[PDB]
Enzyme design. Sequence first.
Site, PDB file in Angstrom:
ATOM      1  N   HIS A 198      -4.690  -2.901  -2.026  1.00  0.00           N
ATOM      2  CA  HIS A 198      -4.941  -3.755  -2.059  1.00  0.00           C
ATOM      3  C   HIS A 198      -6.001  -2.280  -1.340  1.00  0.00           C
ATOM      4  O   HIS A 198      -7.476  -1.887  -1.275  1.00  0.00           O
ATOM      5  CB  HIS A 198      -5.783  -4.358  -0.487  1.00  0.00           C
ATOM      6  N   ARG A 199      -5.370  -1.400  -0.877  1.00  0.00           N
ATOM      7  CA  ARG A 199      -5.714   0.371  -0.216  1.00  0.00           C
ATOM      8  C   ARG A 199      -6.062   0.097   0.996  1.00  0.00           C
ATOM      9  O   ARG A 199      -5.717   0.344   1.821  1.00  0.00           O
ATOM     10  CB  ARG A 199      -6.363   0.856  -1.322  1.00  0.00           C
ATOM     11  N   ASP A 200      -7.825   0.349   0.758  1.00  0.00           N
ATOM     12  CA  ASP A 200      -8.805  -0.214   2.030  1.00  0.00           C
ATOM     13  C   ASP A 200      -8.580  -1.324   2.931  1.00  0.00           C
ATOM     14  O   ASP A 200      -9.416  -1.948   3.033  1.00  0.00           O
ATOM     15  CB  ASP A 200      -9.654  -0.243   1.202  1.00  0.00           C
ATOM     16  N   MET A 201      -7.760  -1.181   3.852  1.00  0.00           N
ATOM     17  CA  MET A 201      -7.049  -2.151   4.468  1.00  0.00           C
ATOM     18  C   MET A 201      -7.473  -1.089   5.291  1.00  0.00           C
ATOM     19  O   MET A 201      -6.570  -0.278   6.122  1.00  0.00           O
ATOM     20  CB  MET A 201      -5.284  -2.626   4.364  1.00  0.00           C
TER      21      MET A 201
ATOM     22  N   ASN B  60     -12.381  -4.028   7.911  1.00  0.00           N
ATOM     23  CA  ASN B  60     -12.395  -4.654   6.668  1.00  0.00           C
ATOM     24  C   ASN B  60     -12.195  -6.337   6.516  1.00  0.00           C
ATOM     25  O   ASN B  60     -11.832  -7.692   5.725  1.00  0.00           O
ATOM     26  CB  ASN B  60     -11.703  -4.404   5.394  1.00  0.00           C
TER      27      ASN B  60
END
Lengths: 191, 61, 61, 68
Positions: A63-66, A70
Site C-alpha cells: 500500500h505504502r501510502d498508508m 487515506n
Amino acid sequence: NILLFMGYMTKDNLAIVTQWCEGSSLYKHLHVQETKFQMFQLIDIARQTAQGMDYLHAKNIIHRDMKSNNIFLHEGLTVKIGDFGTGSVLWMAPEVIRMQDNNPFSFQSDVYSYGIVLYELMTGELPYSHINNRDQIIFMVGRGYASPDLSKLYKNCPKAMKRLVADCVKKVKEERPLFPQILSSIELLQH
Amino acid sequence: YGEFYKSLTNDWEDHLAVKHFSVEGQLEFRALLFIPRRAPFDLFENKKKKNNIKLYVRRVF
Amino acid sequence: YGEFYKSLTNDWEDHLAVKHFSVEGQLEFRALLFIPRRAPFDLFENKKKKNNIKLYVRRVF
Amino acid sequence: WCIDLEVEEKCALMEQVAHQTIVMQFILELAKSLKVDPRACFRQFFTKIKTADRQYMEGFNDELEAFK
C-alpha cells in the site's frame, strides 16, 4: 364512427443510479472534527482496516501510502482504504523517513504505518505531539531516540491493544507482526 | 434457529421470523426462509444476481 | 453494411456509424460495431435481457 | 376497398376487417399521439391494450352500417 380518446397505456420505470458519500477520512473525524467513538467501535474500525490490509498483502500489493486521511468511513462505519486522499513524514517507518535505501517497501512498512494509525485511534492525538520540529522528527525517529508516547493511550484500551500498538511500531522490521497475526490478535482482543 | 441464522448470514442480531417446511410430491425439498430484523443498506442497490436463497442438492451447494 | 445491419438488428433505418476492425496474436478475432441513429425506445429498461453483442466461434453462435 | 362490402351487405368480412381497421387506427393514432414513427410500435403495445378493459370495437360493429 369517432376518433375516441385512449387512456394511455403507461409505463413505470423503477431503475436506480447509485450514489456514494464522500465521508470523512479517519484523520478528519479524529483530529479536525474530533468526533468520538466507543472503544468497541474503535476496535471495529481497526479490524476492518486490518482485514482490508491483509487482502492487499495477499495480492502482493504494498500500500505504502498508508495515512489516516487515506482511510474513509461510510454508512455503517464501513471502512474504505484507498490512494484517494505534517503527514509527508509522520506515518512512515524509521528507514523510510530516512530514505535509508532505495524505496525499501515491504509489508512491514505498511505494518508500521498501521501501528501509527492504531496509536492515533487509541489516543485521539497525533504521535510525538509534545514536539513538532521537522528535523527533530527525522533525527529522533530515524535514529531511535523516541517511541510514540504510549502513556497517552485511552484508559479503556485493552492491554492487548496497548501491546498491539507497541508491537506494530517496534523499531526493527524483523520485530513487528504481519497482518495475519495482527488481525488474529484483533479478533481475539475484540471477543 | 437463531444460531443457525447468525452463522448463515454473519448477522450480529437474531432473526425476526422463520418459515420452515417440506414439500412432499415428485419434488422433495426442505426450505428455511428467514426475515431479518433490519433491511440491509443495499437491499435494492447491488444489482447483480443474488436474492440470498441458496440451492443445495443432497446437501452439496 | 446497411443491409447487413438491418438484417442483424431488425431496424428499419440505417446505422449512424459503423466500425470494422480486427486483432491478431494469441487471441484472434474480427468484429463489427454499429451505432444506431436512434436510441431504442426501451434502451434503459432494467427488466429486459440485452441481445446487443453476439459472440460467434468459427461462425457458429 | 370495403365499399363493395357495404353495397353487398357482407357483414362477416366488414366485422373481421373492423379488427384490422381499429388496429391500424390504434397504431397510427398512437404514433401521432407520441410524435413517433408508426414503424416503431411493438406487439407489447397490443399486449398493453389487452390489459384491464380491452376494446371499444362494439361500436365499430355499427360503423360498418353507420358509415354508409
